[PDB]
Every structure is written in C-alpha cells, then in structure tokens.
Amino acid sequence: GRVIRNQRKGAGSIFTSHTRLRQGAAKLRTLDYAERHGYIRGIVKQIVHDSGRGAPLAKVVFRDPYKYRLREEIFIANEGVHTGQFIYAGKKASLNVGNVLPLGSVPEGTIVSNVEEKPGDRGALARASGNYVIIIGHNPDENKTRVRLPSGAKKVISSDARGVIGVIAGGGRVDKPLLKAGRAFHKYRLKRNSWPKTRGVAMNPVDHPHGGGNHQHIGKASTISRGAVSGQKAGLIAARRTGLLRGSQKTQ
Amino acid sequence: YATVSKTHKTVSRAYGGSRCANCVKERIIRAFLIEEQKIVKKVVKEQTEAAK
Amino acid sequence: NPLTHSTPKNFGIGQAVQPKRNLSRYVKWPEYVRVQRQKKILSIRLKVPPTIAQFQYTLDRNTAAETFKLFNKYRPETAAEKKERLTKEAAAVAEAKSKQDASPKPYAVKYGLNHVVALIENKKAKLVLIANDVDPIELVVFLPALCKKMGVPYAIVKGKARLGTLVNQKTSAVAALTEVRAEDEAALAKLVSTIDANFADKYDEVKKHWGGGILGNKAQAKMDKRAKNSD
Amino acid sequence: ALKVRTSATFRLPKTLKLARAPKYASKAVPHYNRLDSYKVIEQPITSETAMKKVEDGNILVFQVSMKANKYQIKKAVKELYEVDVLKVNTLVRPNGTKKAYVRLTADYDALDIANRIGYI
RNA sequence: GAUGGGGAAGCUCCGUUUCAAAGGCCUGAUUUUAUGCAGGCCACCAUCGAAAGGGAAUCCGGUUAAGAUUCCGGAACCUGG
RNA sequence: GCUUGUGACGGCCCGUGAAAAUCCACAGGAAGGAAUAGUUUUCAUGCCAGGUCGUACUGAUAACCGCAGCAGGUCUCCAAG
RNA sequence: UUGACAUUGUGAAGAGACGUUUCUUUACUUAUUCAAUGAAGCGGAGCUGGAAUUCAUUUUCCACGUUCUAGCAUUCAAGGUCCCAUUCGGGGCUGAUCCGGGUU
C-alpha cells in the first residue's frame, strides 16, 4: 500500500509550522541570582498579539544586573496586566497578579499560569488562552509542591519551579462558533498545514486502513492497540473506553 | 539625513529628536517627585527605626 | 575635601550595576583543562588498589634534598667530557697498549628503566629512586615489589623531571646508583636507613591498604552536617 | 598567587604569528607586465561610422583588450599617442571584442592624430 | 550550506552555534620607527539565496540607416577622498 | 467627470497582515580646548576621483513553448470622443 | 515490548542462600542520562546585632541594601587610607569578610 498521511507528518517538509510573523518565543526570565534570592522589577512596555496564538504576549523589559543595558523578556500576558505595570519576579516577590514567584513561595489556593516543569526551564504548563494551574498544597520533604493542572491531572513539582500569578489572557476564545470554513482556513494558515481533513474512509485502501470501499465503513474495530505499528495507528488509539458519556468532572 | 544640517534633525531641549516636549515634561516632574519622596522614604524609615 | 562628595553604591539585588568581581571559580575552561582536572578527581573517587596507593607516598623535602645532593655527586659525563675522553682513549690506546684502559673506572648514577630493572635483578643496585608520577603507571608499579623481593632499598621520590636533571635530560623515570666512591659510603647507609624505614619496611602494611574515597568538598560538608547537626 | 579573571569567558591566548621567510621562493622569474600598452590597445576601429566619430566628435575609437578597463585605456592612449583624455566610454562588441570610445581634450584634434597614426 | 564535531564499511549523513582555546576595532606608548607594544571595552557571530522585496544620487532639449535617463548641449545631485 | 496619488477617519478578524543591510538622533561626558590669540570642515564656497558585467530587437494569429511562420499556451504598465 | 548478560561503581536496613556472601524496599557521585547559562555569585564558616537558656556558657535560634509614580542607574566608584616628592599622571588596600577552585 501507500505511506499513509499521518506518517508523512514526521519528515517535516510540507507539514512544519508557519512562524514568519511570530514575535519571539514565550519564556520566563532565565533564573538568575536576583530571582533566586530577592526580586527584580520590570515594566510591561506593550502587550502584543502573537500570530497562531490567541492569548497575547506581554513584552516586559528589566534592567541587567551585570551590565548597563536594558534586557527584554517576552511573557504571555496574564489578564488584568497592563502597559506601564511593574512586574516583580523572585523569591521575595509579592503575591500580585502579573508577578512571578517560586511555587513554594505561594500559599495553597494560589492560581498561577506559565509555570515551570523543572525549575529554571522557563515555562511549560498552562500557557494557552484562559488557563491556570492551582496550588493544592506543599511538602517540605524536598521542596515540592502539588499542583492541579488544566487537563485535570494533579502533579508534584519542585517548589523552586516558578509560576506567574494569575490566568493567561485570551478569555473564552473557543466559545465563538467558527461558522465558515474560511475562518477555520485562516486559523490554520497561521499554524500548520493540518486543514482541511480527508476522512480515511473516503480514501482507497492504498491510502488508509479505512480506505477500502463499496460502502463507506471502517470494516474492523476502529480502536487500535498502543503496540500497533506506525502505519497502523489511525483511529482511537489505546482507547480505554468509547461512545458518549456526559461525565461532569475529572480526577480529584 | 546624513546629507542634512543638525538643526533639521533636532529641537533645542533635552531629548531633541528622541522624546516630545510633553514627554520630557512628564519625564522631569516624574523624576523630581520620586527623588524627593525617596528622601522622605528614608527619613520616615529612620523615625520608625529609632522607635524600636 | 568639601567639594568632592561621598556617593556610596547599593551593590545589592535590584539596583546599581554590579561591579566586576573575580570569577576564576566559574570560568568555562578549555576542554583540555577540565579533562586533566577531572581525571584527577575521578581517580580520587573510586577505591584505588593498594599497589597504586603505594605511590602518593613521595618523600619529605629534607630527605629528598639529601638524596639529591648525593645523587648530584655522580653526574654522567657531559657531551664534551666524553668528547675528549675518546680522543684521549682512541688516539692513544689504539696507538699503544691497554685495551682502551687510558681512563679511570667511572662512577655514574645509572638511568633508564630496562637498565635499572636488570640491575635490581642481578642485585647490583644499592639505592633506587622511582618517580611517583610515571604515566602509564604500569611502567613502574611492580618496582616496589621487585626491590622488596630482591632486598634492594627503594624510595618513591617526587619528580620524574627532577630525575631528568640528575642525568641531564627531560625526564628519567628512575635513577639508581650501584658503585659509589669510598668517601661517600657513609651517607649511603645513612640515607638508606631513613629511607627503608619509610618504604621497604612499611611495604607489607601499605600493600594491605587501599586509597580513594573523598566525597569532594560540597558533598563532604553535606555528610559532615548530617552528623554534626543531626547527631 | 591566583590571578584575577573578571570574565567567566576563556579566549584563545594571543600568540605571536610569525611571518613567512622562505628558503627557495615560489617563482624563479616574476612574470613581466601582462597587459601593457601595446597589449591594452590593439587596433583602430575605422568603420565609416567610427570615422564620423573622429571628423565630428573628437573621439578616438579603438578595439581594446577585453581584459582591460577604463583606467587602463586612458593610460595607454595617453602613453602611446601623447594625448590628454576627458572620459573613456566602453562597450563589449557583439563579436566578443571590446570597443573603446575615447574623446580627447580640446587642446588636441582627433582627426589630426587620426591620420597622424596613419588612417583616415 | 562550508567549519570544532557526532554518525556511516564507504560514496557521504547529521548539526549551523551547534558540548569548540573560533576575533578585530579605537588608539596611546615610542618620536631606534609609522610601530613591536601598552590602555581597553565590543562580539553564542562562515557564506550562498530577490534584474517584481529593502536600497546613496539626473533631468530637459538635440541627435543615428540602427544607440541613448548611457552620445551632444545645457543644467544638477550622490558618494569617497 | 476618468485614471492615479495621497490624507484624516470608519468596518473587518479564534487572520491583527516580513526581515536585514543602511541612515539618523538623543542619553552620556571621556577628552581636547583661548586672549595676542585657537575652537570648530553637521554653515557657504573651492579641489580631485567614481571601476566591472548587461544595454540591439521580438515579446507573439511569424523573433518564446507547443516537430512549423501552428485558430492552443505564456507574467505586467500606459488608455481619447 | 519483555527477560538476561555486558556498560556496573561504593554504604546500609530486613527476608533469606551455608563474619564472607547472593536475593527486595534504599543512602551515596564519580560512570552514564537531561537542561540552562556570555559557565556569577554555589558550598562551608564568619563581622554586625535583637532575643533566649543557664540557676550563667555559648547550648542555639532570628535578622543583616530594592514595592504609592510608564524618571534615572555605564568610564577599574565616590569616599576613606597608603605609597611615587607627586608638575600630571598613575598604583595599591579598603569600599565590597574569609575560606574550598564542584559553573549551576
């Protein structure tokens, strides 16, 4: 048969990401002596819209502890934060929205965004529009803090992992019906070549495990073993269950 | 601009090109009032410092 | 004087552009610098076997300078000495009698590994200097046990390049005299005395003891405090 | 000791850099000036339309070396004919030669220096 | 897409600042000299890739069988010294 | 009125619509500077130089591609009553 | 994907195989593995000083430059103190505690 479509994604090519008009990479400041012991002020100079990313980026510039020069980091704006607002980042920083602190330096119930996975990795979790992680508790058995993550899983990371106080900006973007193919069009035009989508069942057999015809149907269970081989993985992969559920909450 | 005389490229005040009158006015007033209240910041915290 | 002012700086977090300090602790050295520095450290961790632990036992400055002052008294011929000694020997002994016996029997320090090793085996040596820092160390590991087996005084002396000077080279690995003039026969038995009390007669104890360990600074305190505060 | 380094950055130590002092030299005999004057300018162009550029323009029209530029033409025309030169104009002919358009200063007469050289 | 490298039997593959000791500017000393040197900050940086993207500055009149914002005439502007 | 340029505004986006060379300016105040003389060449005037390669013509129901002087194909500017 | 052997090293609890020694939860860091930084501020101890206990002692704790403001922060740093007889220029010690060179 033919190399199926999801295998072609791998070799980059036609499928890499559209980044020409992206600002910078969103990152916290490099964890330095300042943040590691005290704090350091910065002003947000503008909050700007990054292409391919609803939820805006705040450009907040600091001074350089070691040379006379201005050094600008790029944050993900956090709603409520404004132009001109001072930003204090460090251990001794104050519990204010916009600021950024170690996870151990914030009480239980603090909601923070753009938090780190390992300390100093400069940001990993809750970064998409409107997201936040919740601090549920601490554990001075090696500087650890237990957080609740957007997906719902609760995870324990080091208390020296920085978060930034508040939610990510960008409201309820997914609340507006997309309406036209054209709007979806422009959407993925600024991300990656993933749209539109051809149903595997609308293909011929060469192209897809579903491609066989004379009637459009998958013909075998559409639930695939995790151990299945690249080339076979199309459908609902290690699907624990399937069908409708209406299931309220997560895993607390 | 490299074919041109400096009066074309300036006004006569602090930040000739750079900033804009109202922007250098607020610039000064802002400077003054903080520098002042800096001393007041320190003195006050040398009154309460003598209290204990 | 009251026109110049005192304007102190705030050199703490959050203000005043930090002033140039000394970061020799932090410099990212060339890769060749870290490898020679860390091949020391690595070899310091890991229990090192006693027959490599034999070395590191060098020689005190005073007994070393004593052995060197004596060894200096037996320099091998220079380039120019042997130059004339041969236009003295050949342009005479090949013009008369004495099979090249127109020169006094020499007294030399004896150098070179293959040379020395056979001297230790034929029991001709009277004292032997072995550099603590020969690499590859297998070149010399067995020499303490060679000596101790044969009944030959040895000392592990600091400097493979200090022995080079005693034979007018760059390095000389080992040095060991065999003959010695009769006036010097005194200090010989004197040095060997102080020496064989530090090495050959300790050999049996040293062989029983490994080296290595040492957590390296930062971890050592972490264990120290773990038993200083928590005990 | 120690020595104080106020940078965590190690650089390559500036080292001498000697200077070449050979032992037998590359060439045996240097090459003579390739592209001199008799080489630069090669041949008058005397089309009936280049002649009108002499009788009426005070231009001297030479097929000049393809390897040669506007400076070197001006030089040669000066040195070979004892003339002074305003500007030299050049186009690469379509037959793969180079044609120089050389207008002389008012002190000189191209038409005279034309049948001086020996054509008209 | 070369380079310290790291893969590969190898044709080569990977990586492009990449885990690399990766430099070139101002200038004084010295007035044996136009220069070796003495102040020194600056610098995670080959190069290729647009005759429609960015970009220093020219116009009018006249002229040929065929060239012209390029020649003639006049009048300008830019750059580097 | 037509074409085109351009301004102050207004609608639109889960789309908010390049980069670099390059030019300037400010902040800074190192350093250099006069009174029998010295400062300045971002003011006017004056002097010299500006290399290499392309430059013709067709651009289409005959100069290109479709075996061709082929009813096909092949990007663009100007536009009178 | 699963097991084994090799890369593979040190300290222990036990339940076990007849003080060595191999077995499951586990401490070490030097192998190996991950990330950052123009390898900056790690680690140990101190100067200062506010409390304490002890029925007096050092037996330890605690603190030790930045938060009304969309300024400003750079020339080995001013000051202080030493030297060069010091014309003008320099330099050193503090300013800015010591100690390990484990960049973190």
UniProtKB/Swiss-Prot annotation, chain A:
There is a cross-link at K45, K92, K118, K144 (Glycyl lysine isopeptide (Lys-Gly) (interchain with G-Cter in ubiquitin)). It comes from the Eukaryota. Keywords: Cytoplasm, Isopeptide bond, Phosphoprotein, Ribonucleoprotein, Ribosomal protein, RNA-binding, rRNA-binding, Ubl conjugation. It is found in: Cytoplasm. The modification Phosphoserine is found at S51, S94, S158, S159, S248. The keyword rRNA-binding applies. GO terms for cellular component: cytosol; cytosolic large ribosomal subunit. SUPFAM superfamilies: Nucleic acid-binding proteins, Translation proteins SH3-like domain. Belongs to the universal ribosomal protein uL2 family. This is Large ribosomal subunit protein uL2A. The lineage of its organism: Eukaryota, Fungi, Dikarya, Ascomycota, Saccharomycotina.
UniProtKB/Swiss-Prot annotation, chain B:
It is found in: Cytoplasm. The lineage of its organism: Eukaryota, Fungi, Dikarya, Ascomycota, Saccharomycotina. Transmembrane segments: none annotated. The chain holds residues 62 to 114 of 121 of the full protein. Belongs to the eukaryotic ribosomal protein eL34 family. Component of the ribosome, a large ribonucleoprotein complex responsible for the synthesis of proteins in the cell. The small ribosomal subunit (SSU) binds messenger RNAs (mRNAs) and translates the encoded message by selecting cognate aminoacyl-transfer RNA (tRNA) molecules. The large subunit (LSU) contains the ribosomal catalytic site termed the peptidyl transferase center (PTC), which catalyzes the formation of peptide bonds, thereby polymerizing the amino acids delivered by tRNAs into a polypeptide chain. This is Large ribosomal subunit protein eL34A. Present with 23600 molecules/cell in log phase SD medium. The gene is RPL34A. It comes from the Eukaryota. It comes from Saccharomyces cerevisiae (strain ATCC 204508 / S288c) (Baker's yeast). Component of the large ribosomal subunit (LSU). Mature yeast ribosomes consist of a small (40S) and a large (60S) subunit. The 40S small subunit contains 1 molecule of ribosomal RNA (18S rRNA) and 33 different proteins (encoded by 57 genes). The large 60S subunit contains 3 rRNA molecules (25S, 5.8S and 5S rRNA) and 46 different proteins (encoded by 81 genes).
UniProtKB/Swiss-Prot annotation, chain D:
There is a cross-link at K39 (Glycyl lysine isopeptide (Lys-Gly) (interchain with G-Cter in SUMO)). GO terms for biological process: cytoplasmic translation; ribosomal large subunit assembly. The keyword Transcription does not apply. Keywords: Cytoplasm, Isopeptide bond, Ribonucleoprotein, Ribosomal protein, RNA-binding, rRNA-binding, Ubl conjugation. One of its GO terms (molecular function) is structural constituent of ribosome. It is found in: Cytoplasm. GO terms for cellular component: cytosol; cytosolic large ribosomal subunit; preribosome, large subunit precursor. It comes from the Eukaryota. Component of the ribosome, a large ribonucleoprotein complex responsible for the synthesis of proteins in the cell. The small ribosomal subunit (SSU) binds messenger RNAs (mRNAs) and translates the encoded message by selecting cognate aminoacyl-transfer RNA (tRNA) molecules. The large subunit (LSU) contains the ribosomal catalytic site termed the peptidyl transferase center (PTC), which catalyzes the formation of peptide bonds, thereby polymerizing the amino acids delivered by tRNAs into a polypeptide chain. Component of the large ribosomal subunit (LSU). Mature yeast ribosomes consist of a small (40S) and a large (60S) subunit. The 40S small subunit contains 1 molecule of ribosomal RNA (18S rRNA) and 33 different proteins (encoded by 57 genes). The large 60S subunit contains 3 rRNA molecules (25S, 5.8S and 5S rRNA) and 46 different proteins (encoded by 81 genes). uL23 is associated with the polypeptide exit tunnel. Belongs to the universal ribosomal protein uL23 family. This is Large ribosomal subunit protein uL23. It comes from Saccharomyces cerevisiae (strain ATCC 204508 / S288c).
